[PDB]
Chain A
Amino acid sequence: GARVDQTPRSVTKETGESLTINCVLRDPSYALGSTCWYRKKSGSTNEESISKGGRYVETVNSGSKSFSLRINDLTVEDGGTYRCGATDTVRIYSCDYLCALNGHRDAACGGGTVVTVN
């Protein structure tokens, strides 16, 4: 229904150097309403919400209709798969249920980003 596409799909970065994940809300969606970031740990295959601010920095351009996450001072166990969730000109109460809404015309999670740090 609604779609968000992630880049890059797989990246490996040197320890101590920042990494940037970009997410775009494809047309004909009007504008961004809210942006949620997520990560899962390699073992349990369950996702957890990434708290914005601090070490995790997000940049959003409304005119661009795109948002980015920048990780800093990378640790080796920062690795896993990362998803991003977006929504079209509406808002949500919690980031818990966003990806749970698949094919909805106003909510969509990205494709995923596999990160491995050495």
Chain B
Amino acid sequence: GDTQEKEVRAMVGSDVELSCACPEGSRFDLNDVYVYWQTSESKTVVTYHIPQNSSLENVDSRYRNRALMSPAGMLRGDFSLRLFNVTPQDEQKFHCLVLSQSLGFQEVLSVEVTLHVAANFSVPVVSAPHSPLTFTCTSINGYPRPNVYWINKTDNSLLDQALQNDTVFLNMRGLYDVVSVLRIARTPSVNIGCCIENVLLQQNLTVGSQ
């Protein structure tokens, strides 16, 4: 049971802020406050501020110049961390810790920020090949893994998941692609579409078969 727990949804390749802040007001001394941003599972040190001059280099090469706090923000009580170039490889829980020297080196703030990274898939491409009946659907560059649905545009219902063939790919750049091959018996005027849902973004994209 921490002082605060938070989830942060962040886009790949963007700047994100993980908030560790008090109700702002000029009431913190840099020469007094000790701040530690550290990964929660691996316990490695992402960044930190102490009043004495620090050797640095303690930060592994992973976060060295991509994670930063604001000194003016610290003086206002804003110890938030700023990551600069998010990758699906940063999807982990973080932990912020604040101690005071005026106080008994006591914890003024301790928060856990679970960081969920996501990227939006491309608009699906649907093909209409045939057999004695076959549909293929393609989307790329999304995160995390996608769910795919085939929608009957006539009554806005969803076709059964057993009728579709799903295959998930992990490309370079660490994103996800998907191919879904749907097989259904012939009927007059197939009006259907391929829906691809990014669960974390709560976003679905859909294209119909003309």
Contact = CB atoms under 8 A, between A and B. Distances in A.
A and B touch in the complex (CB under 8 A): yes
10 contacts: A1-B89, A1-B91, A33-B170, A90-B168, A93-B172, A96-B172, A101-B174, A102-B89, A106-B170, A107-B174
B88 interface: yes
> How many interface residues does chain A have, given as a range?
10 to 19
A90 B88 CA distance: 15
Contacts of A105: 88, 91, 144
Contacts of B172: 93, 96-97, 100-101
Interface string B159-185: 000000001111110101000000000
Contacts of A89: 168
A77 to B, nearest CB: 31
Given A1-B92, A104-B170, 11 more contacts: A87-B170, A90-B168, A90-B169, A91-B167, A91-B168, A102-B89, A103-B89, A104-B89, A104-B174, A105-B91, A106-B170
Nearest to B170: A90
Interface of A: 1, 33, 87, 89-93, 96-97, 100-107
B66 interface: no
A104 B91 CA distance: 8
A1 B88 CA distance: 10
Nearest to B91: A105
B89 A92 contact: no
Nearest to B168: A90
Contacts of B90: 103
A103 B90 CA distance: 7
A27 to B, nearest CB: 15
A92 B170 contact: yes
Nearest to A88: B170
Nearest to B89: A103
A101 B170 contact: yes
Contacts of B167: 91
B89 A91 contact: no
Which of B144, B170, B174 gathers most chain A CB within 10 Å? B170
B145 interface: yes
Contacts of A102: 89
Contacts of B92: 1, 103
Which 4 A-B pairs rank lowest in CB-CB distance, beginning with the nearest? A103-B89, A97-B172, A90-B170, A90-B168
A54 B176 CA distance: 32
Nearest to B42: A103
Contacts of B145: 90
Contacts of B91: 1, 105
Nearest to A92: B170
A72 to B, nearest CB: 31
A39 to B, nearest CB: 21
Nearest to A96: B172
Contacts of B170: 33, 87, 90-92, 101, 104, 106-107
